[PDB]
């Protein structure tokens, strides 16, 4: 299963000019495009090797759309400031994410937006109705219902976007369609005279989805398991670890289990 | 309005070995709003030419960024990450531990 | 491939 996603953010700054627009694009867990309004020369640039041979005018179509959604965002922040009867001196944020989630057949699409960190309006799972978070978002729902806005979004989600997502998988098939299994090792740190720490490591895996669990004599353990956020390594892979505290002299009774796409079957580690 | 402090992890791209080239990362996640200041220190001083990732957010609308620079670790050199957000009354300093 | 929509 593969996906194409986009994330757009706009931050207003009263008294400091006009808002700041940024947008990023992704194929599954691999970014490939970006646009910064505060850049020295704002234009869409490639971040992945499989979009560098696409043509300078596809790169102007893309750029001209980024500059369009930035102007559209400027108006929305003004309307949203009026919807909530908000003062003129405060900064606000407007987030927007959407994508297409295709056996290779199209499955689902999504389109959601947020105002100042909270949910605002979202395209429903049928891609025909909306869900407004409050009364202010009902003003938007009334507008996009009379404009038949949902039908235009569905045309892109189930049409143009599954076309280009299918195309990106062919041009970068050597990296996009190749899972990398995690590389694991276990450490040990004595805390006191009767306490120690066991850390199960998972490095260099792709995609980012992974599960880590500690077990004492075959029973799941989460009362004493520390879990960090899956973090990027900076080279296209990800890392993660999980730590459990144990009585010293009992470390041999603990096992770490790893679940990942690239493994033939789950792992089972000991110190 | 939402206001959330960032999560800070300091680590390296590959296992840290002395005298070998690597990358030093500072990953800030789960913060709102997006304006944030991040610096990387070597023996207590700012490192120049620090690149960072492009802005992005998670399913709960909280942002994340990665700050990275090339470096070759040694026995004695210390490294830290300095973050400043609207939720912080003063900069937070997280030291680099070779086992986190 | 990006897509720009309407105003909120």
XYZ file of N, CA, C and O in Angstrom, chain A residues 75-230:
624
model
N -6.471 35.137 2.178
C -7.862 35.558 2.299
C -8.568 34.773 3.398
O -9.382 35.326 4.148
N -8.271 33.474 3.511
C -8.939 32.641 4.507
C -8.652 33.128 5.922
O -9.555 33.167 6.767
N -7.400 33.501 6.200
C -7.060 34.015 7.522
C -7.824 35.294 7.836
O -8.147 35.555 9.000
N -8.125 36.099 6.814
C -8.927 37.299 7.025
C -10.378 36.938 7.323
O -10.991 37.493 8.242
N -10.943 36.005 6.553
C -12.303 35.547 6.817
C -12.397 34.877 8.182
O -13.331 35.132 8.951
N -11.428 34.014 8.498
C -11.440 33.319 9.781
C -11.303 34.297 10.941
O -11.889 34.091 12.010
N -10.533 35.370 10.748
C -10.441 36.403 11.773
C -11.780 37.099 11.978
O -12.098 37.518 13.097
N -12.575 37.224 10.919
C -13.887 37.827 11.021
C -14.942 36.857 11.509
O -15.880 37.255 12.206
N -14.802 35.580 11.141
C -15.739 34.563 11.612
C -15.765 34.508 13.134
O -16.837 34.473 13.750
N -14.591 34.505 13.757
C -14.466 34.404 15.204
C -14.462 35.759 15.899
O -14.318 35.803 17.126
N -14.615 36.854 15.152
C -14.577 38.209 15.705
C -13.291 38.442 16.496
O -13.305 38.914 17.635
N -12.166 38.105 15.875
C -10.869 38.198 16.526
C -10.207 39.538 16.229
O -10.436 40.151 15.182
N -9.376 39.985 17.167
C -8.681 41.254 17.031
C -7.666 41.192 15.890
O -7.399 40.138 15.307
N -7.087 42.350 15.580
C -6.189 42.489 14.442
C -4.725 42.259 14.792
O -3.904 42.130 13.879
N -4.377 42.186 16.075
C -2.985 42.230 16.505
C -2.368 40.859 16.758
O -1.197 40.792 17.146
N -3.104 39.771 16.543
C -2.654 38.441 16.914
C -2.304 37.576 15.717
O -2.920 37.683 14.654
N -1.313 36.707 15.903
C -0.927 35.746 14.879
C -1.805 34.502 14.951
O -2.234 34.079 16.028
N -2.062 33.911 13.787
C -2.885 32.715 13.696
C -2.288 31.766 12.665
O -1.482 32.161 11.819
N -2.696 30.501 12.749
C -2.187 29.446 11.886
C -3.339 28.769 11.155
O -4.434 28.607 11.702
N -3.080 28.379 9.908
C -4.047 27.662 9.082
C -3.337 26.481 8.435
O -2.462 26.670 7.584
N -3.709 25.269 8.837
C -3.096 24.048 8.337
C -4.058 23.317 7.409
O -5.280 23.408 7.555
N -3.491 22.589 6.449
C -4.284 21.875 5.453
C -3.491 20.672 4.969
O -2.357 20.826 4.505
N -4.082 19.484 5.078
C -3.468 18.262 4.584
C -4.485 17.479 3.766
O -5.691 17.522 4.029
N -3.981 16.770 2.760
C -4.815 15.965 1.879
C -3.926 14.930 1.209
O -2.697 15.028 1.238
N -4.559 13.936 0.599
C -3.789 12.912 -0.080
C -4.680 11.850 -0.680
O -5.910 11.887 -0.565
N -4.024 10.893 -1.333
C -4.683 9.779 -1.997
C -4.008 8.490 -1.566
O -2.779 8.379 -1.613
N -4.815 7.519 -1.156
C -4.342 6.303 -0.501
C -4.832 5.097 -1.289
O -5.787 4.439 -0.887
N -4.172 4.798 -2.404
C -4.556 3.629 -3.191
C -4.206 2.344 -2.443
O -3.258 2.310 -1.659
N -3.100 -3.962 -3.726
C -3.527 -4.408 -5.046
C -3.258 -3.349 -6.111
O -3.260 -3.637 -7.309
N -3.026 -2.119 -5.660
C -2.790 -1.005 -6.549
C -4.015 -0.188 -6.892
O -3.883 0.838 -7.571
N -5.198 -0.600 -6.447
C -6.419 0.129 -6.753
C -6.611 1.291 -5.788
O -6.167 1.252 -4.637
N -7.282 2.336 -6.273
C -7.609 3.470 -5.420
C -8.463 3.007 -4.248
O -9.425 2.253 -4.424
N -8.097 3.445 -3.045
C -8.881 3.115 -1.864
C -9.595 4.353 -1.337
O -10.790 4.537 -1.592
N -8.880 5.219 -0.623
C -9.505 6.356 0.032
C -8.723 7.632 -0.235
O -7.544 7.609 -0.599
N -9.420 8.757 -0.050
C -8.790 10.055 -0.027
C -9.223 10.815 1.214
O -10.171 10.430 1.904
N -8.508 11.902 1.491
C -8.766 12.680 2.693
C -8.436 14.140 2.430
O -7.601 14.461 1.580
N -9.108 15.021 3.169
C -8.882 16.459 3.051
C -9.344 17.096 4.354
O -10.547 17.134 4.629
N -8.394 17.580 5.152
C -8.692 18.130 6.465
C -7.928 19.433 6.651
O -6.849 19.625 6.084
N -8.503 20.328 7.453
C -7.908 21.629 7.719
C -8.109 21.987 9.184
O -9.058 21.530 9.826
N -7.207 22.817 9.704
C -7.221 23.191 11.110
C -6.912 24.674 11.248
O -6.183 25.251 10.438
N -7.474 25.284 12.290
C -7.280 26.701 12.586
C -6.732 26.827 14.001
O -7.414 26.474 14.970
N -5.500 27.326 14.113
C -4.842 27.560 15.400
C -4.676 26.273 16.205
O -4.737 26.290 17.435
N -4.466 25.147 15.521
C -4.171 23.885 16.163
C -5.363 22.973 16.374
O -5.171 21.769 16.583
N -6.580 23.505 16.331
C -7.785 22.717 16.542
C -8.439 22.375 15.209
O -8.263 23.078 14.211
N -9.201 21.282 15.208
C -9.920 20.862 14.012
C -10.901 21.941 13.572
O -11.521 22.615 14.399
N -11.040 22.107 12.258
C -11.957 23.109 11.734
C -12.985 22.481 10.803
O -14.155 22.330 11.170
N -12.560 22.123 9.593
C -13.438 21.502 8.612
C -12.670 20.382 7.922
O -11.445 20.438 7.777
N -13.402 19.348 7.512
C -12.787 18.156 6.948
C -13.721 17.517 5.930
O -14.938 17.475 6.130
N -13.137 17.024 4.841
C -13.886 16.249 3.861
C -14.199 14.869 4.427
O -13.306 14.171 4.917
N -15.468 14.475 4.361
C -15.871 13.193 4.914
C -15.363 12.047 4.038
O -14.886 12.244 2.917
N -15.482 10.828 4.570
C -14.893 9.660 3.923
C -15.521 9.352 2.569
O -14.871 8.718 1.732
N -16.760 9.780 2.330
C -17.371 9.588 1.021
C -16.930 10.630 0.000
O -17.274 10.500 -1.180
N -16.182 11.651 0.430
C -15.732 12.745 -0.432
C -16.909 13.491 -1.055
O -16.810 14.018 -2.166
N -18.030 13.540 -0.336
C -19.211 14.279 -0.765
C -19.771 15.216 0.293
O -20.448 16.185 -0.072
N -19.521 14.968 1.576
C -20.043 15.788 2.656
C -18.897 16.327 3.502
O -17.760 15.853 3.423
N -19.212 17.328 4.316
C -18.254 17.961 5.207
C -18.631 17.704 6.660
O -19.736 17.256 6.978
N -17.686 18.003 7.549
C -17.916 17.981 8.990
C -17.319 19.254 9.574
O -16.095 19.422 9.582
N -18.179 20.151 10.047
C -17.744 21.419 10.612
C -17.585 21.293 12.121
O -18.413 20.674 12.795
N -16.513 21.889 12.649
C -16.210 21.748 14.069
C -17.022 22.700 14.938
O -17.293 22.384 16.101
N -17.412 23.856 14.412
C -18.203 24.809 15.184
C -19.123 25.564 14.228
O -19.356 25.128 13.095
N -19.645 26.704 14.687
C -20.528 27.510 13.850
C -19.746 28.237 12.762
O -20.219 28.358 11.625
N -18.542 28.717 13.087
C -17.727 29.406 12.090
C -17.432 28.505 10.898
O -17.472 28.953 9.746
N -17.142 27.228 11.153
C -16.907 26.283 10.070
C -18.181 25.931 9.312
O -18.093 25.340 8.230
N -19.355 26.275 9.849
C -20.589 26.100 9.091
C -20.722 27.150 7.996
O -21.368 26.898 6.972
N -20.130 28.331 8.198
C -20.088 29.336 7.139
C -19.312 28.807 5.941
O -19.719 28.987 4.787
N -18.181 28.146 6.198
C -17.417 27.532 5.117
C -18.192 26.386 4.478
O -18.193 26.239 3.250
N -18.861 25.569 5.297
C -19.635 24.455 4.759
C -20.766 24.951 3.867
O -21.047 24.357 2.819
N -21.424 26.043 4.265
C -22.483 26.615 3.439
C -21.933 27.129 2.115
O -22.600 27.037 1.077
N -20.715 27.675 2.131
C -20.100 28.163 0.901
C -19.715 27.010 -0.015
O -20.090 26.986 -1.194
N -18.964 26.040 0.511
C -18.480 24.938 -0.310
C -19.597 23.994 -0.736
O -19.406 23.215 -1.676
N -20.753 24.043 -0.072
C -21.891 23.248 -0.518
C -22.575 23.886 -1.721
O -22.934 23.189 -2.676
N -22.757 25.209 -1.692
C -23.391 25.894 -2.813
C -22.463 25.984 -4.017
O -22.936 26.066 -5.157
N -21.151 25.974 -3.790
C -20.179 26.016 -4.875
C -19.879 24.643 -5.458
O -19.139 24.560 -6.446
N -20.440 23.578 -4.881
C -20.118 22.204 -5.268
C -18.612 21.964 -5.203
O -18.013 21.356 -6.093
N -17.996 22.458 -4.126
C -16.550 22.350 -3.971
C -16.114 20.899 -3.810
O -15.042 20.509 -4.289
N -16.939 20.083 -3.149
C -16.560 18.700 -2.877
C -16.351 17.912 -4.164
O -15.481 17.036 -4.229
N -17.138 18.209 -5.201
C -16.997 17.484 -6.459
C -15.673 17.796 -7.145
O -15.108 16.928 -7.821
N -15.160 19.018 -6.983
C -13.865 19.356 -7.566
C -12.734 18.631 -6.848
O -11.785 18.160 -7.487
N -12.820 18.530 -5.519
C -11.796 17.817 -4.763
C -11.787 16.333 -5.107
O -10.716 15.741 -5.290
N -12.970 15.718 -5.197
C -13.049 14.297 -5.529
C -12.459 14.017 -6.906
O -11.852 12.962 -7.128
N -12.623 14.955 -7.843
C -12.035 14.788 -9.168
C -10.517 14.688 -9.088
O -9.903 13.876 -9.792
N -9.892 15.499 -8.230
C -8.442 15.438 -8.084
C -8.012 14.205 -7.298
O -7.048 13.528 -7.676
N -8.713 13.901 -6.203
C -8.291 12.815 -5.322
C -8.339 11.468 -6.036
O -7.376 10.693 -5.991
N -9.452 11.173 -6.700
C -9.635 9.894 -7.374
C -9.211 9.923 -8.836
O -9.288 8.888 -9.507
N -8.762 11.068 -9.344
C -8.374 11.165 -10.737
C -6.915 11.508 -10.959
O -6.089 10.619 -11.183
N -6.589 12.802 -10.894
C -5.246 13.257 -11.246
C -4.198 12.736 -10.270
O -3.064 12.440 -10.665
N -4.556 12.620 -8.993
C -3.566 12.324 -7.966
C -3.195 10.846 -7.914
O -2.037 10.517 -7.628
N -4.143 9.943 -8.178
C -3.783 8.535 -8.301
C -2.991 8.283 -9.576
O -2.264 7.288 -9.665
N -3.110 9.170 -10.566
C -2.334 9.031 -11.794
C -0.859 9.322 -11.545
O 0.015 8.547 -11.950
N -0.563 10.435 -10.869
C 0.827 10.822 -10.663
C 1.483 10.032 -9.539
O 2.695 9.793 -9.585
N 0.712 9.619 -8.529
C 1.259 8.725 -7.513
C 1.671 7.395 -8.129
O 2.713 6.832 -7.774
N 0.866 6.882 -9.063
C 1.247 5.674 -9.786
C 2.499 5.899 -10.622
O 3.297 4.973 -10.806
N 2.687 7.118 -11.131
C 3.849 7.398 -11.967
C 5.122 7.494 -11.135
O 6.188 7.039 -11.568
N 5.030 8.074 -9.934
C 6.211 8.216 -9.088
C 6.752 6.865 -8.637
O 7.966 6.718 -8.450
N 5.877 5.872 -8.457
C 6.337 4.552 -8.037
C 7.176 3.878 -9.114
O 8.024 3.036 -8.799
N 6.958 4.230 -10.383
C 7.724 3.623 -11.466
C 9.095 4.271 -11.621
O 10.087 3.578 -11.872
N 9.171 5.595 -11.472
C 10.433 6.300 -11.654
C 11.383 6.134 -10.476
O 12.599 6.257 -10.660
N 10.866 5.860 -9.282
C 11.716 5.624 -8.132
C 11.481 4.266 -7.507
O 11.503 4.127 -6.280
N 11.267 3.251 -8.348
C 10.917 1.922 -7.859
C 12.051 1.260 -7.090
O 11.791 0.363 -6.282
N 13.296 1.675 -7.322
C 14.428 1.070 -6.632
C 14.512 1.498 -5.171
O 15.051 0.749 -4.348
N 13.961 2.660 -4.826
C 13.918 3.137 -3.448
C 12.523 3.123 -2.844
O 12.375 2.830 -1.655
N 11.490 3.424 -3.635
C 10.141 3.535 -3.091
C 9.510 2.176 -2.817
O 8.745 2.038 -1.855
N 9.805 1.172 -3.641
C 9.216 -0.150 -3.465
C 10.250 -1.143 -2.951
O 10.440 -2.213 -3.539
N 10.920 -0.800 -1.850
C 11.944 -1.669 -1.272
C 12.024 -1.358 0.220
O 12.590 -0.334 0.614
N 11.456 -2.240 1.037
C 11.521 -2.071 2.479
C 12.906 -2.439 2.999
O 13.570 -3.342 2.483
N 13.342 -1.725 4.032
C 14.625 -1.970 4.677
C 14.364 -2.466 6.093
O 13.779 -1.745 6.907
N 14.792 -3.693 6.381
C 14.511 -4.291 7.675
C 15.378 -3.654 8.763
O 16.502 -3.218 8.499
N 14.874 -3.583 9.994
C 15.628 -2.917 11.062
C 16.841 -3.721 11.501
O 16.857 -4.954 11.454
N 17.868 -2.996 11.936
C 19.081 -3.576 12.500
C 19.066 -3.326 14.003
O 18.992 -2.173 14.441
N 19.131 -4.401 14.787
C 18.857 -4.339 16.215
C 20.070 -4.748 17.041
O 20.938 -5.497 16.583
N 20.104 -4.242 18.272
C 21.080 -4.626 19.282
C 20.566 -4.132 20.627
O 19.760 -3.201 20.695
N 21.032 -4.772 21.698
C 20.522 -4.524 23.042
C 21.664 -4.067 23.939
O 22.759 -4.640 23.908
N 21.403 -3.038 24.743
C 22.350 -2.506 25.713
C 21.880 -2.828 27.131
O 20.848 -3.472 27.341
N 22.653 -2.363 28.113
C 22.383 -2.670 29.513
C 23.054 -1.618 30.384
O 24.241 -1.331 30.204
N 22.295 -1.048 31.325
C 22.812 0.012 32.185
C 22.399 -0.205 33.636
O 21.210 -0.103 33.966
N 23.343 -0.501 34.530
C 22.996 -0.637 35.952
C 22.657 0.717 36.561
O 23.401 1.688 36.403
N 21.527 0.774 37.261
C 21.083 2.010 37.903
C 21.562 2.090 39.345
O 22.175 3.079 39.755
N 21.280 1.057 40.138
C 21.675 1.043 41.540
C 22.332 -0.284 41.896
O 23.044 -0.871 41.075
N 22.103 -0.761 43.115
C 22.625 -2.048 43.549
C 21.639 -3.188 43.323
O 21.945 -4.331 43.675
N 20.468 -2.895 42.741
C 19.464 -3.916 42.475
C 18.541 -3.501 41.335
O 17.402 -3.979 41.256
N 19.008 -2.624 40.450
C 18.192 -2.131 39.351
C 19.072 -1.932 38.127
O 20.225 -1.508 38.246
N 18.522 -2.243 36.956
C 19.246 -2.074 35.705
C 18.253 -1.756 34.596
O 17.041 -1.934 34.746
N 18.787 -1.282 33.471
C 17.997 -0.879 32.316
C 18.385 -1.712 31.102
O 19.573 -1.916 30.831
N 17.378 -2.190 30.375
C 17.568 -2.889 29.111
C 16.951 -2.055 27.998
O 15.779 -1.674 28.083
N 17.736 -1.773 26.961
C 17.300 -0.935 25.849
C 17.366 -1.738 24.559
O 18.440 -2.206 24.168
N 16.220 -1.891 23.902
C 16.122 -2.563 22.614
C 16.164 -1.513 21.509
O 15.318 -0.615 21.473
N 17.140 -1.629 20.612
C 17.379 -0.636 19.576
C 16.887 -1.136 18.224
O 16.957 -2.330 17.921
N 16.394 -0.204 17.409
C 15.972 -0.494 16.041
C 16.461 0.633 15.146
O 16.015 1.776 15.290
N 17.372 0.315 14.226
C 18.045 1.322 13.419
C 17.958 0.979 11.938
O 17.942 -0.193 11.552
N 17.900 2.022 11.115
C 18.004 1.896 9.670
C 16.890 1.138 8.979
O 17.160 0.368 8.048
N 15.645 1.345 9.396
C 14.506 0.664 8.802
C 13.656 1.643 8.000
O 13.697 2.858 8.207
N 12.883 1.088 7.065
C 12.023 1.841 6.176
C 10.979 0.841 5.700
O 11.353 -0.263 5.270
N 9.686 1.179 5.757
C 9.094 2.455 6.202
C 9.186 2.691 7.710
O 9.772 1.897 8.441
N 8.591 3.780 8.202
C 8.762 4.180 9.593
C 7.913 3.371 10.565
O 8.180 3.408 11.771
N 6.905 2.650 10.079
C 6.029 1.891 10.963
C 6.776 0.709 11.569
O 7.349 -0.113 10.847
N 6.763 0.619 12.899
C 7.483 -0.433 13.609
C 6.859 -0.586 14.988
O 6.309 0.367 15.546
N 6.938 -1.798 15.534
C 6.437 -2.104 16.867
C 7.547 -2.729 17.702
O 8.283 -3.597 17.223
N 7.662 -2.280 18.950
C 8.648 -2.798 19.889
C 7.952 -3.126 21.201
O 7.168 -2.318 21.709
N 8.238 -4.307 21.746
C 7.639 -4.748 22.998
C 8.656 -5.535 23.808
O 9.428 -6.324 23.256
N 8.651 -5.313 25.118
C 9.436 -6.100 26.054
C 8.539 -7.133 26.724
O 7.342 -6.905 26.923
N 9.126 -8.277 27.067
C 8.371 -9.375 27.652
C 9.208 -10.090 28.699
O 10.402 -10.324 28.497
N 8.570 -10.441 29.813
C 9.209 -11.166 30.906
C 8.641 -12.580 30.935
O 7.482 -12.782 31.317
N 9.458 -13.552 30.523
C 9.077 -14.966 30.494
C 7.895 -15.222 29.562
O 7.080 -16.115 29.808
N 7.789 -14.446 28.487
C 6.753 -14.655 27.497
C 5.469 -13.885 27.712
O 4.513 -14.092 26.955
N 5.411 -13.010 28.711
C 4.232 -12.202 28.987
C 4.512 -10.746 28.641
O 5.570 -10.211 28.986
N 3.559 -10.112 27.959
C 3.722 -8.724 27.545
C 3.932 -7.822 28.755
O 3.369 -8.042 29.830
N 4.756 -6.793 28.574
C 5.079 -5.874 29.658
C 5.021 -4.448 29.137
O 5.758 -4.090 28.214
N 4.136 -3.643 29.725
C 4.062 -2.223 29.420
C 3.953 -1.359 30.667
O 3.786 -0.142 30.540
N 4.038 -1.946 31.862
C 3.997 -1.157 33.087
C 5.283 -0.365 33.286
O 5.268 0.679 33.948
N 6.398 -0.835 32.718
C 7.708 -0.237 32.951
C 8.490 -0.055 31.655
O 9.723 -0.073 31.666
N 7.799 0.128 30.534
C 8.442 0.225 29.228
C 8.415 1.672 28.750
O 7.339 2.231 28.514
N 9.596 2.269 28.609
C 9.729 3.602 28.039
C 9.842 3.503 26.523
O 10.565 2.654 25.996
N 9.121 4.379 25.826
C 9.026 4.342 24.371
C 9.231 5.748 23.830
O 8.483 6.664 24.186
N 10.235 5.921 22.971
C 10.488 7.225 22.366
C 9.791 7.340 21.019
O 9.334 6.344 20.447
N 9.703 8.565 20.514
C 9.129 8.802 19.200
C 10.049 8.252 18.119
O 11.273 8.387 18.195
N 9.452 7.611 17.117
C 10.202 7.219 15.933
C 10.785 8.463 15.276
O 10.049 9.379 14.899
